[PDB]
Amino acid sequence: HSTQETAIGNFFSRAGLVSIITMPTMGTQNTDGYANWDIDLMGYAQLRRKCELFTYMRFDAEFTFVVAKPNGELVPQLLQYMYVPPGAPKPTSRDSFAWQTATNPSVFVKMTDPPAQVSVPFMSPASAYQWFYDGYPTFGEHLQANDLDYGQCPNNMMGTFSIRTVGTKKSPHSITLRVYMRIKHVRAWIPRPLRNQPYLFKTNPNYKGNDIKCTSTSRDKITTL
Amino acid sequence: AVDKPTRPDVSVNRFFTLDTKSWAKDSKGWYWKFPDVLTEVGVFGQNAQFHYLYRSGFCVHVQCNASKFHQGALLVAVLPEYVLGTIAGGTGNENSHPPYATTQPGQVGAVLTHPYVLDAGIPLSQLTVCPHQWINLRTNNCATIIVPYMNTVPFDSALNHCNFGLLVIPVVPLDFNAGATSEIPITVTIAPMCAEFAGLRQAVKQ
Amino acid sequence: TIWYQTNYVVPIGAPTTAYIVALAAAQDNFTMKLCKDTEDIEQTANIQ
Numbered sequence: 272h273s274t275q276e277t278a279i280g281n282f283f284s285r286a287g288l289v290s291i292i293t294m295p296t297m298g299t300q301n302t303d304g305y306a307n308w309d310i311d312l313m314g315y316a317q318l319r320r321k322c323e324l325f326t327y328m329r330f331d332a333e334f335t336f337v338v339a340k341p342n343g344e345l346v347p348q349l350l351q352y353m354y355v356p357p358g359a360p361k362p363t364s365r366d367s368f369a370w371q372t373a374t375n376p377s378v379f380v381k382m383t384d385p386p387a388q389v390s391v392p393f394m395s396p397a398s399a400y401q402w403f404y405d406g407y408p409t410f411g412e413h414l415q416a417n418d419l420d421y422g423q424c425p426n427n428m429m430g431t432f433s434i435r436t437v438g439t440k441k442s443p444h445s446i447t448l449r450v451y452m453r454i455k456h457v458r459a460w461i462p463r464p465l466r467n468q469p470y471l472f473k474t475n476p477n478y479k480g481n482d483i484k485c486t487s488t489s490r491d492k493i494t495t496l
Numbered sequence: 497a498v499d500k501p502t503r504p505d506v507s508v509n510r511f512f513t514l515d516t517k518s519w520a521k522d523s524k525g526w527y528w529k530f531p532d533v534l535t536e537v538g539v540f541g542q543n544a545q546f547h548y549l550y551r552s553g554f555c556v557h558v559q560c561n562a563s564k565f566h567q568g569a570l571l572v573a574v575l576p577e578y579v580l581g582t583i584a585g586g587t588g589n590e591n592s593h594p595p596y597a598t599t600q601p602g603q604v605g606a607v608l609t610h611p612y613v614l615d616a617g618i619p620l621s622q623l624t625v626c627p628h629q630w631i632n633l634r635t636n637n638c639a640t641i642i643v644p645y646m647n648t649v650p651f652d653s654a655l656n657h658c659n660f661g662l663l664v665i666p667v668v669p670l671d672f673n674a675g676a677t678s679e680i681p682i683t684v685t686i687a688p689m690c691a692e693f694a695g696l697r698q699a700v701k702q
Numbered sequence: 703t704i705w706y707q708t709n710y711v712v713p714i715g716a717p718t719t720a721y722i723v724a725l726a727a728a729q730d731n732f733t734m735k736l737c738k739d740t741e742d743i744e745q746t747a748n749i750q
């Protein structure tokens with residue numbers, strides 16, 4: 272019997288959904304024609320439970336960007352992708368100076384073309400990604416209002432991702448984007464227990480206090496199966 | 497780091513005895529945050545305030561004494577990067593973070609609220625995946641665990657970053673009949689190993 | 703200084719109060735010099 276299947280190489284390597292981004296025509300949010308999405312991979316529950324097995328993790332990522340209209344059909348619409356590193360200008364509009372793509376990487380794809388694929392190296396300044404950081408990023412005293420900085424690793428914010436439709440006029444068709452990731456060239460450390468409680472917030476592992484779900488099922492008697 | 501670090505072998509690395517924790521039948525267990533306990537104690541604590549960079553290994557030792565008529569079990573485990581959660585009021589719609597008193601208990605330590613989830617939302621039965629030792633009052637009344645330095649960076653700030661926590665959890669409640677001594681202390685002594693300091697600076701408390 | 707570290711634990715049926723005997727001596731590196739008189743012998747009267 273071969274152990275290749277239970278190895279971390281094949282278990283960590285495949286596509287999963289890390290982000291859901293929409294650009295509706297009518298609404299209070301993305302209707303301006305562009306979207307600015309800060310990069311967070313923990314808004315998705317099931318892949319988060321896989322990455323929480325281990326504390327420190329070092330890997331590379333391949334991405335897949337699928338575009339479709341919320342009803343599922345497609346239109347010949349051209350889209351623009353751009354990656355914004357920390358410190359780089361974030362776009363204030365669709366005609367904004369930031370989308371002009373000088374030194375920032377960009378991807379051009381249509382809605383009739385197959386999904387776009389890119390490869391992202393290891394961009395963290397440390398040796399590996401730190402999922403659970405115990406401490407504070409800031410010096411000095413921390414009051415109740417400054418307690419938000421707890422559990423925040425400054426090495427985990429690698430930039431911001433943004434999308435828009437090309438052209439000056441507004442596009443009549445709505446667009447829904449689904450971001451995918453495949454982990455490759457992975458190295459792992461410090462195993463951790465698997466979380467048995469439902470997720471609540473992205474940034475910190477909060478659990479609902481009223482009901483604590485037992486990790487095992489219950490029965491009537493210990494001597495009866 | 498381009499600086500040449502200090503190695504005060506005798507004044508830094510030695511056994512540090514902490515306060516004793518009185519055991520009770522409903523006791524839920526306590527936890528400490530290293531290296532936040534020794535920041536106020538001895539030469540180790542003073543040089544930690546004058547130095548920005550910190551790397552050392554630790555020595556964990558736990559002491560719980562009992563007689564032949566006492567039956568109990570303690571679980572002493574080391575969990576790297578132990579993050580405290582919050583019940584969020586119990587409803588789950590409120591966003592709240594634990595204050596500095598719970599996240600940085602200091603030398604005295606802090607007590608667990610819901611030991612089943614360890615306030616991490618994770619099962620207690622899986623705690624043995626990390627390095628652990630069992631204290632069974634019928635055989636071993638002591639425990640010793642040698643934990644090296646584990647971080648993604650060689651040096652790091654001792655004040656903000658807590659490396660790992662220490663969990664002494666009374667899994668099996670100690671039972672004793674009437675007339676026996678009801679005061680059972682729990683003594684935890686710790687020592688640093690191979691400490692290196694860098695970035696000599698002014699006095700910084702927190 | 704001698705200090706209580708944990709506690710004195712005793713079963714049922716055994717005394718709860720114990721006594722500790724302290725011993726003292728020297729080592730091989732112990733060295734003395736400059737002989738003199740001590741205070742531990744006194745004559746307030748003749749020896750009959």
Ligand SMILES: CCCCCCCCCCCCC/C=C/[C@H](O)[C@H](N)CO
Pocket residue numbers: 310311312313332334352353354376377378389391400401402427428429432
């Ligand atoms: C051409 C467009 C390329 C878009 C590139 C976006 C970079 C996304 C990289 C994701 C790799 C993991 C980064 C961090 C993941 C988690 O969100 C962090 N732990 C946040 O705490």
